[PDB]
Design an enzyme around this catalytic site. Structure first.
Site, mmCIF file in Angstrom:
data_model
loop_
_atom_site.group_PDB
_atom_site.id
_atom_site.type_symbol
_atom_site.label_atom_id
_atom_site.label_comp_id
_atom_site.label_asym_id
_atom_site.label_seq_id
_atom_site.Cartn_x
_atom_site.Cartn_y
_atom_site.Cartn_z
ATOM 1 N N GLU A 11 0.780 -1.211 0.000
ATOM 2 C CA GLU A 11 0.000 0.000 0.000
ATOM 3 C C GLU A 11 0.829 1.288 0.000
ATOM 4 O O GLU A 11 0.341 2.304 -0.440
ATOM 5 C CB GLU A 11 -0.895 -0.014 1.252
ATOM 6 C CG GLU A 11 -1.902 -1.171 1.229
ATOM 7 C CD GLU A 11 -3.035 -0.975 0.259
ATOM 8 O OE1 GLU A 11 -3.037 0.184 -0.347
ATOM 9 O OE2 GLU A 11 -3.869 -1.809 0.066
ATOM 10 N N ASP A 20 -6.428 6.713 -4.823
ATOM 11 C CA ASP A 20 -6.004 5.336 -4.983
ATOM 12 C C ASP A 20 -6.041 4.908 -6.447
ATOM 13 O O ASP A 20 -6.305 5.706 -7.344
ATOM 14 C CB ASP A 20 -6.689 4.388 -3.971
ATOM 15 C CG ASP A 20 -8.117 3.985 -4.299
ATOM 16 O OD1 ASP A 20 -8.589 4.470 -5.382
ATOM 17 O OD2 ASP A 20 -8.738 3.182 -3.670
#
Ligand SMILES: [Cl-]
Ligand SMILES: [Cl-]
Length: 162
Positions: A11, A20
């Site tokens: 991540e 994202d």
């Protein structure tokens, strides 16, 4: 290697609101803020999550605190889900980490949707499960991360992350 170090590699860490891979407002270690397009709706969620007026920026400690909560919620989500729990119980420690990674990324509902793969994992048919896991939008959209997760399921080792 462990779940935290694994997810921190997949991540990354960002101290400023960012978007994202799907275009949603996120912060820290993959902490989804909102699916809404409004950056203001994002700032609001953020302040609510931290308990202070952040102006879209957080500290490392704050990022880590959100991360600790999210991993905990992911595990507890698995253990509360009738479809997931049996699979999880059947797995070794490394593979358990892989399932936690999928749930953190796509939510319990999403993973629970991988019916056929879940069955193959439960039966310990590693190679077949890895093939089925790859026929998904998930793999197609985030192929490098999917491959790492999938290899962890196939092998039962941390090789993809070393
Ligand atoms: Cl929260
Ligand atoms: Cl990727």
């Amino acid at each position: 290697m462990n779940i935290f170090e694994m997810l921190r590699i997949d991540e990354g860490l960002r101290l400023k609101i960012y978007k994202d891979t799907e275009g949603y407002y996120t912060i820290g270690i993959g902490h989804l803020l909102t699916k809404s397009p409004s950056l203001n709706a994002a700032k609001s969620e953020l302040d609510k999550a931290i308990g202070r007026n952040t102006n879209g920026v957080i500290t490392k400690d704050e990022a880590e605190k959100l991360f600790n909560q999210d991993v905990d919620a992911a595990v507890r989500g698995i253990l509360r889900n009738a479809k997931l729990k049996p699979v999880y119980d059947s797995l070794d420690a490394v593979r358990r980490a892989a399932m936690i990674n999928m749930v953190f990324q796509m939510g319990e509902t999403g993973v629970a949707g991988f019916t056929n793969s879940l069955r193959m994992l439960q039966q310990k048919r590693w190679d077949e499960a890895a093939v089925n896991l790859a026929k998904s939008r998930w793999y197609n959209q985030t192929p490098n991360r999917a491959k790492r997760v999938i290899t962890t399921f196939r092998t039962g080792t941390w090789d993809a992350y070393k």
